[PDB]
């Protein structure tokens, strides 16, 4: 909505569509699509470089350096499967109700735009301070590539830095527990109580 990106790139995709198909997939709807593509590409952009660093390391202080990375990788592999799965089940639910109901066109237009507002609110989850910890997560990626170019005090600086986002993860988990018991927050509790029994 009125927010900005979480990196350096102004890159996004926009779909080109004309009449009378522009009546149902709006140009306002493309802007709602333009916010979710920036979020999902960026955490995928993280997953690529982090995985490459892990494979390079694969190919004690070094056992503990592998211990922080595998803990942080398994944290970010689980949360992004949750975002992939719990987007996807509103996707099959939004597919089925266009098959169940469809008798008017402004209805299935407003059916679709109310779905993007659910996807936008799930990606507006990183509004107050979470976009700062994803950038603080990214600054310890590039601090770990600054020692990829260097091959221990550097490793315990990473243990201090990888315990820094851990205490901020519980801060974001504490921010996940605060509203008036709405459904998207109840959605983000059971997914993160999934992250609690581990």
């Amino acid at each position: 909505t009125e927010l900005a990106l979480s990196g350096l790139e102004s890159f996004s995709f926009d779909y080109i569509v004309k009449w009378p198909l522009s009546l149902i997939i709006n140009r306002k709807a493309l802007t709602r699509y333009q916010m979710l593509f920036r979020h999902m590409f960026y955490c995928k952009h993280v997953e690529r470089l982090l995985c490459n660093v892990w494979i390079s390391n694969k190919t004690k202080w070094f056992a503990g350096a592998f211990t922080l990375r595998q803990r942080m990788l398994n944290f970010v592999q689980n949360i992004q499967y949750y975002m992939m799965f719990e987007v996807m089940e509103p996707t099959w639910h939004i597919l089925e109700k266009n098959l169940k109901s469809a008798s008017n066109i402004d209805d299935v237009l407003s059916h679709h735009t109310s779905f993007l507002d659910n996807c936008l609110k799930d990606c507006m989850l990183t509004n107050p301070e979470l976009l700062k910890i994803f950038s603080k997560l990214m600054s310890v990626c590039v601090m770990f590539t600054n020692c990829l170019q260097r091959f221990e005090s550097t490793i315990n600086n990473f243990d201090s830095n990888f315990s820094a986002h851990l205490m901020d993860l519980l801060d974001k988990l504490s921010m996940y527990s605060t509203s008036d018991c709405e459904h998207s927050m109840i959605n983000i509790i059971y997914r993160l109580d999934f992250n609690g029994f581990y």
């Binding site: 995985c51 592998f66 499967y81």
Partner: protein, 436 residues
């Protein structure tokens, strides 16, 4: 892009990779000599990830097969699936080998055919400018697959340092020791190379094969013709995110990265339930996903001989549960809901655990688009029971004066036996230390 070169090697490694390529044509909708079905591109969205990319819509396999015994390759060319293989990539007609049964035979034959063994297998490397890695589809049983396979784990570590190494290696059989007696020697020599000269392995026990081969398969005389049926399905099952279009961990460096805790701890437990053809008549009533992963953590489909009373002091760290084909994904989060209530996996007390579930659509085929399939890639710390089984059979044999004079005549001058013993105990001690 994501091209992997399979290194099929040995008497058993060539036969388990022969039907692995034969499994791939039945699911891609292609024939080994032609293209008669149009189901290859509309149904399957990606085919050039294990095959070589096409020149005439003929997907060449990216495979090499070397063995000292010519018997395994003479049972290939009369089969109609050998015309898909090329007679110029590996060998032409009438290829041979040694005499030959020794671990020191193939270990000494690697540096006398050193010019030819690094010439024709490197021609497939520069076909793609971004190589994925190398999988050594070799064997531990015998001296053929264990003798020469230990050499390529060393010289491909520095000539190709930025490539993934991970093997689907089969473990030998420990029932009696009459036909072979050199089994504790050649196994531990390769097992040292599998931990420090190799990143990951996929263990496949032989004593656990006939536990399953008489479980539901109902045979009376165990033959070698059944060893290729359990192995070739789970090989193609492991690349369903990689061959078929998936999203997350769709590479081989995606799956192995999310399961290995540390180097020298990479031995992954495998599980695969559906192997019966008369289950097909009752899967028409919407058999769900809520019952297929309750039996994966239950020790019934496992292919690892381990202790039954040793799981209380051992803890799971990483467990993979792969569903394939029809999943009904509106209840796949419902299946993962029931995991925390049972706590069938013991969790590590020092750090978090992870139950990763993933899906990919299967082949457009009637036995594949109807029956649910579950592939397990576990990682449990009770795997030292096999390492305690192999080490207790190793030090007992050296006190009986067995193969100490019959083994050190060729290319062995110093005692490298305790070099394998301490490094095996380093693995066994760091496993129990890993849960603090």
């Amino acid at each position: 892009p994501r091209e992997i070169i399979t290194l099929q090697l040995g008497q058993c490694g060539n036969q388990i990779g022969f039907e692995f390529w034969k499994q791939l044509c039945a699911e891609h909708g292609i024939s080994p000599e032609g293209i008669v079905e149009e189901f290859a591109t509309e149904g399957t969205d990606r085919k050039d990830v294990f095959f070589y990319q096409a020149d005439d819509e003929h997907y060449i396999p990216r495979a090499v097969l070397l063995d000292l015994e010519p018997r395994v390759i003479h049972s290939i060319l009369n089969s109609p699936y050998a015309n898909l293989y090329n007679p110029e990539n590996i060998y032409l007609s009438e290829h041979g080998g040694g005499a030959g049964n020794n671990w020191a035979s193939g270990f000494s034959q690697g540096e006398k055919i050193h010019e030819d063994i690094f010439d024709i297998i490197d021609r497939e490397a520069d076909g793609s400018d971004s190589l994925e890695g190398f999988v050594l589809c070799h064997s531990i049983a015998g001296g053929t697959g264990s003798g020469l396979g230990s050499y390529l784990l060393e010289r491909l570590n520095d000539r190709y340092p930025k490539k993934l190494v991970q093997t689907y290696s089969v473990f030998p059989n420990q029932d009696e020791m009459s036909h072979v007696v050199v089994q504790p020697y050649n196994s531990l020599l390769t097992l040292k190379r599998l931990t420090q000269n190799a990143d990951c392995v996929v263990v496949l026990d032989n004593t656990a094969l006939n536990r399953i081969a008489t479980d539901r398969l109902h045979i009376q005389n165990p033959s070698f013709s059944q060893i290729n049926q359990l192995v070739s399905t789970i090989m193609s099952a492991s690349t369903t995110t990689l061959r078929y279009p998936g999203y997350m961990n769709n590479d081989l460096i995606g799956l192995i990265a999310s399961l290995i805790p540390t180097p020298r701890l990479h031995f992954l437990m495998t599980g695969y339930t559906p192997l019966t053809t008369d289950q097909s008549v009752a899967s028409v009533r919407k058999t769900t996903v809520l019952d297929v992963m309750r039996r994966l953590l239950q020790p019934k489909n496992v292919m690892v001989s381990t202790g039954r009373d040793r799981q209380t002091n051992h803890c799971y760290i990483a467990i993979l549960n792969i569903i394939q084909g029809e999943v009904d994904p509106t209840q796949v989060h419902k299946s993962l809901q029931r995991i925390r209530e049972r706590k069938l996996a013991n969790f590590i007390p020092w750090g978090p655990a992870s139950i990763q579930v993933a899906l990919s659509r299967k082949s457009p085929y009637l036995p594949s688009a109807h029956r649910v399939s579950g592939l397990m890639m576990a990682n449990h710390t009770n795997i030292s029971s096999l390492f305690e089984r192999t080490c207790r059979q190793y030090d007992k044999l050296r006190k009986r004066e067995a193969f100490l004079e019959q083994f050190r005549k060729e290319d062995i001058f110093k005692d490298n036996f305790d070099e394998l013993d301490n490094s095996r105990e380093i693995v066994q001690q760091l496993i129990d230390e890993y849960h603090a």
